[PDB]
Structure formats: C-alpha cells, structure tokens
Design goal:
transferase; two alpha helical sub-domains; monomeric; mainly alpha; Helix Hairpins; DNAb Helicase, Chain A
Length: 146
C-alpha cells in the first residue's frame, strides 16, 4: 500500500457489523460508539440498517435486515453476522475495530496502537519496534492536526 494512506477502515466496519448484527443494543454501539460512514453502499447499508430498524422493530433482525441488501452485502452480511465475533462481541475486538472505524483526529485510536505497538516494544513486528514506533509518530500526526 505505497500509495494508500487511509481510504477507509472497511475492515473494522465489517466486523463492526458482525457485533451489531446481533442485538439492537449493539446497534446503538455501532451508531453511537462509531457512527461512521465510508464509500460503501452495502457496508453503509448495514450500519444504516440498524439505524432504521430501530424504528421498525427496535432490533436489527439478522434474517430480516441481512436479506435487505442488493447482492454483495447479502453473502457478506450473512457471514458477517458473526464471521469474526463472539456472543459477547469480544470486548478487545469491540474497541479494536470501532476505534479503527473512527479514522478521525482521535488520539484514542492511537491508544489502541499503544497496546499493539507496545507488544512490538517487547516482541516487535519484524526485527525492531521501530516499525510500530513509526506507527505512533504516524498516529500522533493523524490525531494531531499539522
């Protein structure tokens, strides 16, 4: 990804969907704890699904909403219902992807990096923590307007 700064965190948005695809309460988490919106009609349709479903039945019915997309979110959403998440939403994962969904000037996302990066301090990613460390200074720039 030489010429790919940060187009969108669709990865977190997809797993995000997985946790919200479970309960309306979680649906609040996606909208309230993330309230994002990338350039994806299908993925966005999921985040959008819940928002509207609240007025509908107050519960993001998977079988009902999962079968409301055009064709790409159909197979994706069905699997995404819990493709990479547990009944408990996976706390570590919840904060991981939601934070990723932020993709905004929020240092808290860097905090998440603080955890993984610190793991790099002790074990590193490749050879030296300098890689993840660079990620911090990178994280500092994004959250800190320059």
């Amino acid at each position: 990804m030489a010429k790919k700064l940060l187009p969108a965190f669709q990865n977190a948005e997809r797993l995000l969907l997985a946790h919200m695809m479970r309960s309306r309460d979680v649906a609040l988490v996606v909208q309230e704890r993330i309230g994002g919106r990338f350039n994806i009609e299908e993925h966005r349709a999921l985040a959008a699904y819940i928002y509207a479903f609240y007025e509908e039945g107050h519960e993001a019915d998977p079988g009902a909403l999962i079968s409301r997309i055009p064709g790409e979110l159909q197979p994706l959403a069905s699997e995404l219902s819990l493709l990479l998440i547990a009944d408990d939403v996976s706390e570590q994962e919840l904060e991981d992807y939601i934070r990723h969904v932020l993709n905004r000037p929020k240092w808290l996302m860097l905090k998440v990096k603080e955890q993984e990066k610190t793991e790099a301090e002790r074990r590193k990613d490749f050879l030296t923590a300098a890689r993840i460390a660079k990620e911090m200074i990178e994280m500092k720039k994004m959250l800190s307007s320059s």
